[PDB]
Write a protein that binds this ligand. Structure first.
Ligand code: GTP
Ligand code: GTP
Ligand code: GTP
Ligand code: MG
Ligand code: MG
Ligand code: MG
Lengths: 429, 435, 429
């Protein structure tokens, strides 16, 4: 009931998804072979939302892993946790997009999308009652950004009356992984703003600091970095996967959070984050949980909220608490930190409570804040994209595979408009 | 029927009340937990009756710091008190009058008034308030002056009895006592009907000499003062051949509205071994209580005059030799009364002998005399305490703590001239009147 | 309730505190591992004042240990009694202040003062009522004096309606540990007399003499020296940690003993101090205790009281006694020694009695005297500072890191004013 479709694009999506389906398997008591070995029947109460029933009590995920370059798939197939996926879903192309938008939207986008859309339709018809779509990708790569935009569009005419959540890894200010980031990002964001519902922007170096500073890890690899982002992603969904005292669903989050069609870029955060050695000297209690969430340091996006104002805020608890303690503390937060909240939405705190605590923790929480601190992220990206484009650098290889200058002019004009409306509403009276 | 509520502020009030309420439960034959192992109402004046067999007192324990109330909660008398009435603050006044009367005391005075109103509505024939407050403390002096303002406005004209702890001349635990005592007296001079005074060292001489005790803990001192506290309200809870209720003391011991500062005394107070070698007759306990060395305030009566007196016998007492004993006492020239009071004695007899708690320093006696004297001899103590205040205030010492907590310098001047007026009047009426 | 924050600055504060938390642990029956192993329930009645309740009945002290160099924390962290502190509190820098005021208040202190201040605000949010701050530092070092004053000015801004006590270690008149003492001390006092409520001045040679003649020890190391100052420091606090016949607390002491805003420099003292061998020839009773403290020999500050007059005096008894014997002796002390008390404060004795005896002792006492004889200590220090400053010796390395000539002129101009009033009130009529 209320089934969810999970789509993966680019190298990041497959690596994040590899850690994702690891978390879900432990949550639902699923052996790597694919057979139920747990005890509680509560996990079976709603198992069809993600997994799928099969013969001999086998379970297969509703995931569609697809990427142009094959190199990622041999890793997921040959590696562990590859005995439970559906071999038909393992879609791959022939050559990677090469960090090019054009090769991800016109050249190799044509033949690959037709194949992947077929598996979506078959998966949708198998579904009993569709709830929405989940897409995990990156805005810096070529295949994940370029094709993911194409897939988001092709899905959109097919299911107009549906919602989707895109958990994108937005590029960093400090360190840039690839040289031509702004060309892929600016083009991708223009299309997403047109035809998407909500978007959870996530940074890398911000999660780098969190792992090194708070968890005190000397060598934070991609294994640990992707592990933390999976827990936030599992926390967002678990409201409808598991019963709770004040339940919420993907539809509830979308409407509570998005006041306007063009302002749907969120910023997540998770708590508690404690080291292995320092967990014994801290009291696991709601006061410190909410305090840990509401500081700039424990935030998974590299934008300090102090330069902006929280437009709307969510908080999806887990474990067992009191609504009194939960909402008494939201009062203490609101009264003390009132200078940082937008004046013209009152009571802008949405709270939901579950009952199943996360593994190895008495209780935890997930904070999703639609803030005005993203305006500094888009301003910087637009600045980087502007200077590079005026001198017409790297342009010969987007023009040489389908596009021309009119796409670049209109994408820049739209992005300037969006940051204009974003600021003009923050400074409204 | 007849009701009076007890308020205990400061550490002095709570510690005294722990022993004072320790004695009532023994006079009325109730176990500490409310069960039972003269008796026929009686307990309706102090012990409110619950539907079950348990009785709970009409007490209001209020303090600003929680160090001492927690002793009461965890003490042996834990199931007795009503858990709501034990009101605690967070931090004390730190021997500062300004803190406990302006800044922190104001933030909690509404909570205690709430329980006062709930306790008064539960009773029918309320008469007055018994306040056990010290003088040198912070929450026992500044906070209790606030309660007088709150209680007086709510209840217009009711007797307001106070059992103070007069600061000692030579004994002094606090350093800022002359600042606290002068301030609290000037404000309670008009909202108090009569204020009994006790000196801490005065019992020590009594406990060392008469009791023959070398281990005078605060428990031993507090056990002895509670006997006076109980026996003053002995006629309300017990029948007597000449009953005296709380309203008589207001009109028998208060010739003038300002001069309402009597002092307590108890007799007989003798040990257990010395009990065998004493006959303990009525003609001598009247003489013992009138002796200068048995007074419970460190002021000798010989330097002053007795304005009025009041005796409250109990037990095997005949109203004849009692009449005779006072007859010779008045004749004796050691004690001198004021001219305009030809009769200066009030008597009250009761049929219930006082009881003795187990392990007490005092010995069981079939008779007891409790003497409350309004006298001119207390005027000397006021002048001395006034001398300390003007000495410290001359250099403005310790002033910065008060002015920084919500007072002006002009207020200190008014409290000074007020005590000048009280002291001059205390001797102006005590001198002979021409014609 | 009425919690207090304990701050340690410099090497001395860390060394004093390392053994201070030793005595506090025995009083509350705390194993070195951090778990309660005591018997009497009265210990837990007020345990939150110093320790913090945590998961599985573990207790964590409310301590903030900070030093500009890592040479101090290496001992406490690696050594015993280091498995119960919270590692977040173990704040340290990289290079020591180097016995310089500038390198601890202007240049190096500012970098680390933001980290400790953020811990202070985070320190006892769980803590529900602040009673005050307890600071242990030195007046001769660089980090102990330099940034310790920096913390005082900054902390006072955030908590103005609060009282704090600094248990400083005032310099010596016979042997000086560091060559540039007067420059470091005088610059510190000019800032201390403005942002503190009371200061406990403690010497070292006076502690040496006491441990030599009275305790019969010929070679007292720093371990046997700091044990004497811990008991005095624990004696002042224990009024609000344990029940007593006449209770007191931090706020109570400040009112009785600060007649004027600038005259708040106290002199402690402890008794009984008897050797283990000669403990059988003395009867433990109140008579000798009051006489023991009031002689010049058993005094922890090397200033002979006979050249001055006591202004106000404490006597925070412990153990069990009768207040009569207490005030019978305070009467005998007053009458026989009436020539050593100021005339314009009558009855200048404050007495408080507790109910829990110190470890291995029937009764004990702590004497705190706001005596006038301190005026001879500041007279000597201002004499040494004057001789060095006219020659401008050692000064070329104070102006070189932030200061100038005008600052030194005002610090001495204010200091001679303080010693003027500290004596003008003694001779005032
Ligand atoms: N969080 C996270 N991000 C990653 C990880 N690996 C790569 N990324 C991000 O993903 C981007 C890589 O772009 P992709 O879309 O994966 O490109 P690709 O899959 O190699 O194929 P092409 O687009 O054709 O190059 C980089 O900019 C990284 O910032 C990862 O393991 N975890
Ligand atoms: N008779 C008697 N007097 C006491 C006792 N305890 C304290 N006192 C007196 O109380 C005075 C101290 O002031 P308190 O009223 O106790 O101070 P407090 O109650 O703690 O309130 P704060 O001043 O705010 O701390 C001393 O001078 C004592 O004479 C006691 O147990 N029995
Ligand atoms: N009572 C006591 N005093 C000490 C002890 N160790 C050092 N001191 C005093 O502390 C002073 C040393 O200065 P500190 O404040 O420790 O300087 P620091 O912490 O090393 O930092 P820097 O000033 O930069 O070197 C000396 O004057 C000693 O008198 C100790 O173990 N016990
Ligand atoms: Mg790739
Ligand atoms: Mg008190
Ligand atoms: Mg150092």
């Amino acid at each position: 009931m209320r089934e969810i479709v999970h789509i993966q694009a680019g190298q990041c999506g497959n690596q994040i998804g590899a850690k994702f389906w690891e978390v879900i398997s432990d949550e639902h008591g699923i052996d790597p072979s694919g057979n139920y070995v747990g005890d509680s029947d509560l996990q079976l109460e709603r198992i069809s939302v993600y997994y799928n029933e099969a013969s001999s009590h086998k379970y297969v995920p509703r995931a569609i892993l697809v990427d142009l370059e094959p190199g990622t798939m041999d890793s997921v197939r040959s590696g562990a946790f590859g005995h439970l996926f559906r071999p038909d879903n393992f879609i791959f192309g022939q050559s990677g997009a090469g960090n090019n938008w054009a090769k991800g939207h016109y050249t190799e986008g044509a033949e690959l999308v037709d194949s992947v859309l077929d598996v979506v339709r078959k998966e949708c018809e198998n579904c009993d009652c569709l709830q929405g779509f989940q897409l995990t990708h990156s805005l810096g790569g070529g295949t994940g950004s370029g094709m993911g935009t194409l897939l988001i569009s092709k899905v959109r005419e097919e299911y107009p009356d549906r919602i989707m959540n895109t958990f994108s890894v937005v590029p960093s200010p400090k360190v840039s992984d690839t040289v031509v980031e702004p060309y892929n990002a600016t083009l991708s964001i223009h299309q997403l703003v047109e035809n998407t519902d909500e978007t959870y922007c996530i940074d890398n170096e911000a999660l780098y600091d969190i792992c090194f500073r708070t968890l005190k890890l000397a060598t934070p690899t991609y294994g640990d970095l992707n592990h933390l982002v999976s827990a936030t992603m599992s926390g967002v969904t678990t409201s409808l996967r598991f019963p709770g005292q004040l339940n919420a669903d993907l539809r509830k989050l979308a409407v509570n959070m998005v006041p306007f069609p063009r302002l749907h870029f969120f910023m997540p955060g998770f708590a508690p984050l404690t080291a292995r050695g320092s967990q014994q000297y801290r009291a696991l209690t709601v006061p410190e949980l909410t305090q840990q969430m509401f500081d700039a340091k424990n935030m998974m996006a590299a934008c300090d909220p102090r330069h902006g104002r929280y437009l709307t805020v969510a908080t999806v608890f887990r474990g067992r608490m009191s609504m009194k303690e939960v909402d008494e503390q939201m009062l203490a937060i609101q009264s003390k930190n009132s200078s940082y909240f937008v004046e013209w939405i009152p009571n802008n705190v949405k709270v939901a409570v579950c009952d199943i605590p996360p593994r190895g923790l008495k209780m935890s929480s997930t904070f999703i804040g639609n803030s005005t601190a993203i305006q500094e992220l888009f301003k910087r990206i637009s600045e980087q994209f502007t200077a590079m484009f005026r001198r017409k650098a790297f342009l010969h290889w987007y023009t040489g595979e389908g596009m021309d200058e009119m796409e670049f002019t209109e994408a820049e004009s739209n992005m300037n408009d969006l940051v204009s409306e974003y600021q003009q509403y923050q400074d409204a009276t | 029927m007849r009701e009076c509520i007890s308020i205990h502020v400061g550490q002095a009030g709570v510690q005294i009340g722990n022993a004072c309420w320790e004695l009532y439960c023994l006079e009325h034959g109730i176990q500490p937990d409310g069960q039972m192992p003269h008796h026929h109402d009686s307990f309706n004046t102090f012990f409110s009756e619950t539907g079950a067999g348990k009785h709970v007192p009409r007490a209001v324990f209020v303090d600003l710091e929680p160090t001492v109330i927690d002793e009461v909660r965890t003490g042996t008398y834990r199931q007795l008190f009503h858990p709501e009435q034990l009101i605690t603050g967070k931090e004390d006044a730190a021997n500062n009058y300004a803190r406990g009367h302006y800044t922190i005391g104001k933030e909690i005075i509404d909570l205690v008034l709430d329980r006062i109103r709930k306790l008064a509505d539960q009773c029918t024939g309320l008469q007055g308030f018994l306040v056990f407050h010290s003088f040198g403390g912070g929450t026992g002096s500044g906070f209790t002056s606030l309660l007088m303002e709150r209680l007086s406005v709510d209840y217009g004209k009711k007797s307001k009895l106070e059992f103070s702890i007069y600061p000692a001349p030579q004994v002094s635990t606090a350093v800022v006592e002359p600042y606290n005592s002068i301030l609290t007296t000037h404000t309670t001079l008009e909202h108090s009907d009569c204020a009994f005074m006790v000196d801490n060292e005065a019992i020590y001489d009594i406990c060392r000499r008469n009791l023959d005790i070398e281990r005078p803990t605060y428990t031993n001192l507090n056990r002895l003062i509670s006997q006076i506290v109980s026996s003053i309200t002995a006629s309300l809870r017990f029948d007597g051949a000449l009953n005296v209720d709380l309203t008589q003391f207001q009109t028998n011991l208060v010739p003038y509205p300002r001069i309402h500062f009597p002092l307590a005394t108890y007799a007989p107070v003798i040990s257990a071994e010395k009990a065998y070698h004493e006959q303990l007759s009525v003609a001598e306990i009247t003489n013992a209580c009138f002796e200068p060395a048995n007074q419970m305030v460190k002021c000798d009566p010989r330097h002053g005059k007795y304005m009025a007196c009041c005796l409250l016998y109990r037990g095997d007492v005949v109203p004849k030799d009692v009449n005779a004993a006072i007859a010779t006492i008045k004749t004796k020239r050691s004690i001198q009364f004021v001219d305009w009071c030809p009769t200066g004695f009030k008597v009250g007899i009761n049929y219930q002998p006082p009881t003795v708690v187990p392990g007490g320093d005092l010995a069981k006696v079939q008779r007891a005399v409790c003497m409350l004297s309004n006298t001119t001899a207390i005027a000397e103590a006021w002048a001395r305490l006034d001398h300390k205040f003007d000495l410290m205030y001359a250099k403005r010492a310790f002033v910065h703590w008060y002015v920084g907590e919500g007072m002006e310098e002009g207020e200190f001047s008014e409290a000074r001239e007020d005590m000048a007026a009280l002291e001059k009047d205390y001797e102006e009426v005590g001198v002979d009147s021409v014609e």
